[PDB]
Structure 1
């Protein structure tokens, strides 16, 4: 099973294929298994590498998830699959957001140099027989090259680093991830906090204003003063213009804030995984310090000792390999969502301004 690690300017990294490939997930189908009124939803996965489509119910993705988690979980963070919700198994909204989350989940895997070209993931996609599948699902479940053993399939195209060099790279990752986790948890709180404020009390204000104005115009109109008519219209419109800004405001987070939040959630997810991934490397590095203590107590041999080293190094490269894939994608992701949030923001203010500028051009120069 080929899992190579090469070095570079940025340091170790996986070998990214030259012939990249993604995958689409849509067309919420409906399929069946004698139970009466209990038909599970089925999605369609259309790879790009070969155009040959396939179907999969949510339960199969969960299955896929556990496999990937069990197989590489000790080295590669595995994207979280969405929760198992409010018993709303059948309408527009539900399938939509779920299919949205599955789409993003699939693309993550497809983009991963190591996962995307594994047997389990691959066979998960390209399969014809309704039984050619059962065979794979079976082969998958008996693959003992999982857990820590996955490192046994990795081949570093570089020298050894002592136990020392290993422990150090471990600490580093552990300090970055904890830091970024703490950092994203805030960005998430203020955002959720700002969100809650733009969809609630803020609109009501512009709503109270716009109404306050309109009632006043109504009062002037009862004045019964010769020589007026033009103003009460300008006023009344200003109010209605404000009411629309109330709507525009209360309906904006769904166009920008939302994406910024989602991106952060996805990442809070990757981060939540390091607590585990880091405890295993720590134990591994700690177990390699006893090498000397062991060799002297005549428990193992120098060859056994030297293996423990060349072996725990592979671990680092894999956790070096994984981070390098992380950072790579982190930098791309935040640069796109922020770029997106701002753009939407801009248009937002620009739009409001134009709305005011209109009600304005209704009041004479005097």
Structure 2
């Protein structure tokens, strides 16, 4: 009964760490700072990743366990208002970090970028703690921060006219519609991409490896005829054989140059998407109860005041839902535009490289 907690609380409580929301050139949005700071992670007694925020140049170390602590806290606090991606995972008991730390740096960056997650006490303390006590004390301030769940909305304050159930309801279904559809759209590119990946690093190269060796085999036999005029052709035929091997290799190592990234971007968004279900659920559920406000007023189970607060608070929720989406779409555009451009360039360079490798081999052949 948390949704009823925020919708019916006493609320004599005024937020300290107020989270602003405004209406930019188009739709409600978060108040983005003007000092965006990222944070490096690397330099691997257990595994202790070193976080180096490019903002104070004061390092801090954390073991994976700590990250889960951070994610969990973030999830519990802003989880019902903002999509909190999922941390990677420890493959086996030991390549590993290469695909792990990689996804960890990303996770950190995303968090860092978010105009709200970053300015959060809990995120700060995680990055800015001086000693064992300072850390332990902070690592307990959060765990006890009752300002979480649906309650997070109360700390938010939008500077715009209050919304109404009609429009509010549209945005919710609107959002749930787009996200669900995307998760499918993304889920598919992933499927296909993973298959193509298997082929490009699997059988495809073998085929070229095969042809390349077959050619050379022929050439060598051709050279065992003692006929006048073999040197020219045989050599050309051989180098060609080798060229295909080079090509096979070039093919096997190609996915990691491009497909990989397209694939990563999608996994990352597949994650964000995997969060909206529970977010919308909360919004829908909230909207429903508000609808039951009138019937609750007539039955005298709540006063007209209680109803006002319910609307005012559910209306706030809408603003946050949109403020976040604006953040979501904003990044989507930039990210997909970048990775796909990147994927395309790399491809071009790839095929161009093969073409030339052939031209050379070609020009090695005689004319008869």
Please indicate, yes or no, whether the TM-score normalized by the shorter chain is above 0.5: yes
Deviations 1:33-66 (A, max 9, x none): xxxxxx3110111112111111111111110110
C-alpha separation in 2, matches of 1:251 and 1:244? 11
Inter-partner Cα distance in structure 2 for 1:227 and 1:49: 70
Residue 139 of structure 2: SS of its match in structure 1?
Answer: helix
Q: Cα deviations across residues 219-266 of structure 1 (Å, max 9, x unaligned)?
A: 211122234321111101111111110111111001100000010000
Moved more, 223-232 or 263-272: 223-232
Whole-Å separation in 2 of the counterparts to 1:48 and 1:240? 48
Q: Which moved more, 1:79-88 or 1:18-27?
A: 79-88
Which protein, 1 or 2, shows the higher relative CO under an 8 Å CA cutoff with sep ≥ 6? 2
Distance 2:42 2:329 in 1: 29
Cα shift at 1:107: 0.5
Instruction: Tell whether the 8 Å contact from 2:90 to 2:100 is kept in structure 1 after alignment.
Output: no
Q: Equivalents in 2 of 1:144, 1:19: separation in Å? A: 29
In the TM superposition, 1:343-358 aligns within 5 A as: 343-358=345-360
- Whole-angstrom CA distance in 2 between matches of 1:165 and 1:227: 84
Q: CA deviation at 1:113?
A: 0.3
1:26 matches 2:26: no
1:96 deviation in Å?
2.7
Q: Judging changes above 3 Å, is the alpha-carbon distance between structure 1 residues 138 and 223 closer, same or farther for their aligned structure 2 residues?
A: same
Matched, 1:42 2:48: yes
* Residue-pair matches, total: 352
In the TM superposition, what is the alpha-carbon distance from 1:207 to its structure 2 partner?
Answer: 1.4
Q: Distance in 1 between matches of 2:66 and 2:240?
A: 55
Range with greater deviation from structure 2 (258-267 or 41-50) = 41-50
Give the CA deviation at 1:85: 2.1
Residues 157-205 of structure 1 show CA distances to partners (whole Å, capped at 9, x for unaligned) of 0011112221111000000000111101111111111111111111111
Correspondence for 1:286 among 285, 288, 308: 288
The 1-side partners of 2:229 and 2:197 are apart by 47
Q: When the two structures are superposed, what TM-score results if normalisation uses the length of structure 1?
A: 0.94
Q: CA RMSD in A?
A: 1.0
- TM-fit CA distance, 1:365: 2.6
Give the conservation status (yes or no) of the 8 Å contact 2:39–2:54: yes
Q: Which stretches in structure 2 are left out of the alignment for 5+ residues?
A: 1-16
CA distance in 2, matches of 1:244, 1:123: 52
- C-alpha deviation, 1:308, in angstroms: 0.6
Equivalent residue runs for 1:19-168 within 5 Å: 19-28=35-44, 39-88=45-94, 93-168=95-170
